[PDB]
Each structure stands twice: as C-alpha cells, then as structure tokens.
Ligand binder design. Sequence first.
Ligand SMILES: [Mg+2]
Ligand SMILES: [Mg+2]
Lengths: 369, 369
Amino acid sequence: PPRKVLIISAGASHSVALLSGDIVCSWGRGEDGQLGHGDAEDRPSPTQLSALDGHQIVSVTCGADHTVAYSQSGMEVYSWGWGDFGRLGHGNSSDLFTPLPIKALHGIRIKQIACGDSHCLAVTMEGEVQSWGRNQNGQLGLGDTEDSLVPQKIQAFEGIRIKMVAAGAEHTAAVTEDGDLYGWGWGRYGNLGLGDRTDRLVPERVTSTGGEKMSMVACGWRHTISVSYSGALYTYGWSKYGQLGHGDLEDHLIPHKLEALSNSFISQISGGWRHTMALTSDGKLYGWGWNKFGQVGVGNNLDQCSPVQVRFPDDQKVVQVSCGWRHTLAVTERNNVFAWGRGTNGQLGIGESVDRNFPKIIEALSVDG
Amino acid sequence: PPRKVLIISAGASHSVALLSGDIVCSWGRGEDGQLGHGDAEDRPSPTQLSALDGHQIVSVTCGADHTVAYSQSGMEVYSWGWGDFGRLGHGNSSDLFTPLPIKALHGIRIKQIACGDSHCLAVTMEGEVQSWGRNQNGQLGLGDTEDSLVPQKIQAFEGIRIKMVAAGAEHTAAVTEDGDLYGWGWGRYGNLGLGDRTDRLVPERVTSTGGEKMSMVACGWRHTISVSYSGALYTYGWSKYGQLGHGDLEDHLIPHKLEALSNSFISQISGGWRHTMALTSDGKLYGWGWNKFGQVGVGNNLDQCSPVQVRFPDDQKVVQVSCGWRHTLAVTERNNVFAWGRGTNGQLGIGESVDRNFPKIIEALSVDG
Ligand SMILES: [Mg+2]
Ligand SMILES: [Mg+2]
C-alpha cells in the first residue's frame, strides 16, 4: 500500500509531516533546532527525522520555532527546537536540535497538544490540561505570571472535561466537551473574546457566543477562531490585516459570526500569523488576511479582508490545512500535499524556490506531480 | 579611496553600516524589512540604502528585526523593519520596508538611540529620554504595562541628566552624567542589577556598583554590562552560556566586577544574544559566551565563560565592535571591517558563505583584502 501523509503542521518558518509507517519528516528553517535533524540548517525539501524512526509517533504539532510529537504505544511526548522560557518542557531553557522525551508526560494518555510561540498545552484523554513555557501574561492559566519550565496541571479545569485547546503568540483558548468556550493570557487586541482588552491569568468563560455551543477553536498570533455545533464560524481579536474576515479591518472583543460563510459548514480551521484558513465539509478551502507573500493562495499578493476560495488542480477536495507565519500547507482527498506563500527558508518543501501565491504540489509527498 | 566606515551595528540577523559621504549600507536578513531596500530579500553583501542618500545620516542602530538612523542637520530620526508593538514609533503597527521619519521626534536634538527586541529609546542633547514600543514588562519606564506606538517622555528622569541608554530583549538600562546606573523592565534573570528577579515599571537606581560611578552601559538579550570611571568592567544578569564572563555559568543579581580584565581599561562594550564583547583602550578585543556558530571569534566552537582575545591579521587594533544574535562585527584602526559567526542570512557581508569562527574581512567595505 502506497505511502500517505497523515498529519501536516506548519510553524513560523518550518513544516512537519507524519507519513504512513510512522515516519516523521520536516523542512524549512532549521536555525533553532525546530526540524530536529541535529544540525541547524534549512531544508528546502522533506527530510526524514530518523531519530524518531521506530517510536510510533501518531501526531506532530508545530509552535513558532519548536515542534512537539507524541506516541501512544510509547506513552511518550517529545519536543525539540528553541528552548527559551521552557517551551520544550524539560525543566531547563536549553535548545534541542534532536527530539527528547518530556519526562513529566511519560505514561499519560494524550488527546491533543497545542503549541503557541513560547508556551504549550497538552489535553489528556480524561479531559485534563497541563501547560508549560512562557507565562508573563498568564497564558499558562495557572493564576500567576511566572514561566514554567515543566508541565503543570491547570487546576481551574477540575471537574470540567476539556475537548480541545489552542495557543497563539501569548494567549490560549479552549472548548469543553459540553461546548463552553474559554480564553486566557495576553488580551490586548480583544483576542480572548471577553469583551475587553485585559489579560487573564486563569481561564475565563466566553459568555457571548450567540447562544451557541462551540465544537472547536484555533488561534492565530493575535486572533482567535471558533466553530459552533451548527458549523458557523466565529472570529475575534486583531483584524489589522483583515484576518477576522468580516470584509473590513475592525477588531472584535467578543466572537463575531462570519456571515459570508453562513451557508457552509466549517469542518477545520487554522490561524496563521496574520492570515486565516477555514475548510468546509464539502472540501472547499477558504483563506483570508495578510497576503504579502502569497500565503492566502488566491493567485495574487493583495490582502483579503473577506474569505476567498483557494483553488486546486481539477477542483480536488481539501481535507487538511495548516497555517504558518508566512506560508500555508494543505492535504487533499487524492493524498496530494500542497504548499504556498513564502519559500525563502525552504518551508514550501518544493526544493529551491521563489515564493508562490497559489497552491504548489509537493512532489516528495504526493501521488501526483 | 574606499569610504571610511564610521559606524557599524548588528541586529539579530542583519548588519548596517554608515560610511563617509553619509551613505548607509545594510546586509543580512531582509524578511521583515530591516534592510530598507523596499523588497524583502536577504542580502549577502553590503547594499547601499538608496532611500537615505543625501539625508545626512550621522548614526545607525539595529534592534533585533528593525533599524533606526538619525540625521543631526536634518533633525530627523528614521526607522524601518518589523512594526509590531510600535517599535518603529509611527503611531501604528505597520512594518516598513523603506525608512520613514518618526514625526514625533522631528526637530529634536538627538544624543543617542538604543534599540532592543521590541522597544527603543532616544536620549536628547539636554539629557531627557523618550521611549516607545512594547511595554508588557515595564521596559518603557513609563510606569505601566501598556505598549506605546509613539515616543513618550520618561518623566522619572526629570532633573536627572542621562548620558546613555541601552536595551535588551525586554529590559532597559541607563547611566547618568553623574555616574548613576539604572535598570527597568523584565527582571527575571537578575539583569536589572537590583538584587532580585522582579520587574520594574519605572527606572530604579542600582545601588551596588562596587563603590564606583559608571560611564557606559550595554545590554545583551538578558544580561547587562557596565564600565566604571576607572575602566573596570561589570556584568550582571543571565549566565546560562557564560555571557557574564566570570569563569562559571552563574547568574548575578547585582553588578559583578569581571576580575580577569582588571588590568585593562575598557573603552567599548557590546552585548549579544548569548555572547559579549569588550574592547580595551589599547585596541584589544575580548569576546566570551555562546560560541555554537563561532560568534566569539576565537577560531573554534567551544563556549567561553571567560574573556578570550579575538585576533586579527597583523595584530591590527580594533576601534569598534557590535554583537548580533549569532554574529559579531568589528572595525579596525586600518579601516577594515570584519565579521564572524553565523552567515546563513548573509549577515557576514562576504557573499554567500558558510559560518565562520574567526574574523573574516568584508572586502566591499575594507581598505585591505
Ligand atoms: Mg535565499
Ligand atoms: Mg542557505
């Protein structure tokens, strides 16, 4: 049976994928150790992370300049990349150019991991949450502003099963199994959804959600995206570059329904640095926001303040999407992988290349060419 | 005659110089606009910044991912590069890929400008200080934690003539004409020099100074360096990488005299990301700290927790030095410019190049070859 991409994830300037046979590979900027190959060099094409061969990795997640992965059979979480503020979770600030197990998480059943710029969160199968890394604005949700070099349990969520979490530059969001939405950390651009511009040191519930329950949440750098049980899309926080998608540049301090997508059901969402992607249940991908380097994928370099459909060869349906800072990655129904946007660190994975403003196929990972 | 190099300055991944005839050149990483040529591409060789031709620039200063320059006769300060948190001072958060005047400083007599990661300060000829940018940890010295997109006067220095200022990642330091030393902002690694690990929102005087008045101060990312009236060197703050230079890896919460240099008179100092440089009055350059990419300049890749002399062809004396995050620049008495360390963004200025662990001449800017 042919090799397939199972998971993709984009960081600020790098890209990581998990392939069938439990193979991790990475490409793009390598200077901070984020690719995990032991050296500090950029890789313009997908490169196998040999140190994780045989570790039965089942998922990968990129932060800005670090990467995390976990194995079910090994009951192990691994991290690598820039080490400052404890974002790697090992009880020190050392960078890592090769994956190491986060000892504190050994033997814990992992449901999901989220990574921001300088902090990370892990959700367990029992719906508990542990966090680590930078905490200067309360983003760990632990009630103070002191960085944590190791994972700590968020006590605020005792008795509250968390479904998924998300992390931006210096903020955090979560949805519960029963559909409640929370935000905490740096809040100056309205990105917590709480109706003001003030930080929170512990999770606070978002009360104005259209009377709707939320099924998922994602964070861009200073904006936040959520989807309701009815598949309606909400965005809040910073819209300097139109990344909220409402057809203007206004900030929102509470979740605001993106009306232009109301006749679609949103199945996946991703927040980039200054851009946004949303995938419909019919496999149509929509992008908006900052487009200087073509990362919106619509064949130009003009910013887009309303969602525009990203087009693929033969109209093949999209199934996964992940936003980096200046680039975007996607996987289609045909098991093809596409990249677009900034390419100077090799993050597009298409060998040496100029920037691209519409989707370009990654031959190394695709069935087509 | 090749133009005399008057000033050099290094940023995180870029380099800038001012030449005689008032021309500015920049090289290195261009992605955030920090080079100022209008485009976003890296430049591996010194490239003349045409937009400043004829503007009578007398000084240039790099922050991590932005650049500032000012003209005495024009009475203008210019800035360009990454715009987030207001580090450029224009009353908005926009990046600039070409220099623009900071209107708020027009007509003001500038004595000195310092740039950190996300905040900047200017000292006026009258000894007043204005600051702008990120303020999450009080680094603007304005008494609060709200970012400022325009310059604001530091009222705490009313009646206190300031001689020079310096800025690190998220902290700030200053020395007065009378020899007093101050620190403020993010203080978690002891880098304010105040005997603790807590932040300050306004400037606070350092009271443990070895009984000495201070004439100079510089900041690395999370460490701080000062020079006394007798030419003694003091360092404080973070020493994970030996950047304090005391022959161990211990943090210091108050200024600590670097005894190994006690027989020399220090005339210039520079702090890098995880390394440090000091120049003596007889032109000998010493480096120490993190040396992964060869940025200490001593011909190897061993970290150095004590000062080691950086050697130059024919033992030519050094007159200027500037530390980047992963590289270092220097100018010699013969008006040659040398670079060493990381070169992947072109920051060494010597054409496409591998990293270098000892000084390499920049032929474009140098008398010799
Ligand atoms: Mg290139
Ligand atoms: Mg290269």
